[PDB]
Amino acid sequence: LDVTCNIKNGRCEQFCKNSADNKVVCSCTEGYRLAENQKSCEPAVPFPCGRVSVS
């Protein structure tokens, strides 16, 4: 049951990275930041890349 990046991308939304420990560390692309849950990515600018805001 120990999490690593090679299963469900370590439940990271965008980018996974393995650690020396039994932990993974999630990150995000430029203009996003890591959410409170340390998994999801949320915007850190008015208009981040790859985002539609018109509907």
Partner: peptide, 16 residues
């Protein structure tokens, strides 16, 4: 000038 109609595309790294 970035807005809702003019927004960049995300570019990941080699791997992702």
């Amino acid at each position: 000038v970035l807005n809702s109609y003019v927004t960049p595309i995300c570019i990941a790294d080699k791997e992702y």
